[PDB]
């Protein structure tokens, strides 16, 4: 048939080792451009004036970093939220100095990752699956949008986005606690519950299915060879796992429906991580965590410190040291 | 940078030694 149709049928083929798809067509070039720029900047890029103050930060291996201190550094505060493609610079040399790779990497990446999400929908359509895997992935995608896009928007600068590096990430976490008391935000307490509970329920389901594997092997061989791919039957006894777990606690604290059990596993972390992504996204507009500073006082009116006053003393130490040359005026309002 | 120069040999055998163990076990599996 016609060439446009051969092509469409290739793009959407469910025979390709890796699925392309129409989301695939945008995802592929953009993730490649982010990956190649990132790898090259991490090894070789020269220092970057993150805070706009002519004090460059060295992020790359060749300029004296290791795997753990290395980063692609966010773009200059002098740029704020202006678009800064390579073609807006007088020279690559100017682009490197002012943080250009960071913009290239995060934009191509947010985009390619958003299409990753759609591609999961797409393949599930072509396979005849239910479609909501992509909804579970929206929780980590949301989170990336928050630290790379939303938080810089509320604050006026991509320079306050999360760096692309191990130590840069910690830098970002400490500055955020000082400026937003994120630990005292419920949405983050929800995210911790999301991930602690996620890991807990992961170990539980893992340990409970594994606890009730049907003897189909001997002691000289992996019990894994008791499962044959695409076997009609189940390999553990869910009735037996229920009878164990219902006794560990009580009968109705235990799941006896498999579908209800797995939906629980999907929803618990996904929800909580939606909340903590919403957490970073709303503290992007300085709606901060609870403030109980000097909240208890005695008959006279002396302050009686609580543990929240001890948190605020730490916060304050982060406050006054961070970006130590970059404030001229008493309040750090962005 | 003034790094530990026994770090190279330490990283090197850290990789090679357990890596070698696994290759040995995989090949003699494929040949029976």
């Amino acid at each position: 048939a016609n060439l446009w149709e051969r092509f469409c049928n290739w793009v959407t083929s469910t025979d390709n080792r890796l699925y392309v798809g129409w989301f695939g067509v945008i995802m592929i070039p953009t993730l490649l451009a982010a990956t190649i720029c990132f790898v090259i900047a991490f090894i070789a890029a020269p220092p970057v004036d993150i805070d706009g103050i002519r004090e460059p930060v060295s992020g790359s291996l060749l300029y004296g970093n290791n795997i753990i201190t290395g980063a692609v550094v966010p773009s200059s505060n002098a740029i704020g939220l202006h678009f800064y493609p390579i073609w807006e610079a007088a020279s690559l040399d100017e682009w490197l100095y002012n943080g250009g790779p960071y913009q290239l990497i995060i934009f191509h990446f947010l985009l390619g990752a958003s299409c990753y999400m759609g591609r999961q929908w797409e393949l599930s359509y072509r396979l005849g699956m239910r479609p909501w895997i992509c909804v579970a992935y929206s929780a980590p995608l949301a989170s990336a949008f928050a630290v790379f896009l939303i938080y810089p928007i509320g604050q006026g600068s991509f320079s306050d986005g999360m760096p692309l590096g191990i130590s840069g990430t910690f830098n970002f976490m400490i500055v955020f606690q000082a400026e937003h008391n994120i630990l005292m935000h419920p949405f983050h307490q929800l995210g911790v519950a999301g991930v602690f509970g996620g890991a807990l329920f992961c170990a539980m389901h893992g340990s409970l299915v594994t606890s009730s594997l049907i003897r189909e092997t001997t002691e000289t061989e992996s019990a894994n060879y008791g499962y044959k791919f695409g076997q009609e039957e189940e390999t553990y006894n869910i009735v037996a796992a229920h009878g164990y777990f219902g006794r560990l606690i009580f009968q109705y604290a235990s799941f006896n429906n498999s579908r209800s059990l797995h939906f629980f596993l999907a929803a618990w972390p996904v929800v909580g991580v939606w909340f903590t992504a919403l957490g970073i996204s709303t503290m992007a507009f300085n709606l901060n965590g609870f403030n109980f500073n000097h909240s208890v006082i005695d008959a006279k009116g002396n302050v009686i410190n609580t543990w929240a006053d001890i948190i605020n003393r730490a916060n304050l130490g982060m406050e006054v040291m961070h970006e130590r040359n970059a404030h001229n005026f008493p309040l750090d309002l962005a | 940078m003034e790094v530990n120069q026994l770090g190279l040999i330490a990283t090197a055998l850290f990789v090679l030694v357990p890596s070698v163990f696994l290759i040995i076990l995989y090949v003699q599996t494929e040949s029976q």
Binding site: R17, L18, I43, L61, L62, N66, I67, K228, F229, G230, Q231 | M1, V3, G7, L8, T11, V15
Partner: peptide, 30 residues
């Protein structure tokens, strides 16, 4: 020598990725 070691190890990981995907034990249905 430290920069080299890091890039070498990262390069082996990416090579691993390629054989893990394209040269896997292919799954089969019995």
């Amino acid at each position: 020598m430290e920069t080299i070691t890091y890039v070498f190890i990262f390069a082996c990981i990416i090579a691993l990725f390629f054989f893990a995907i394209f040269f896997r034990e292919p799954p089969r249905i019995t």
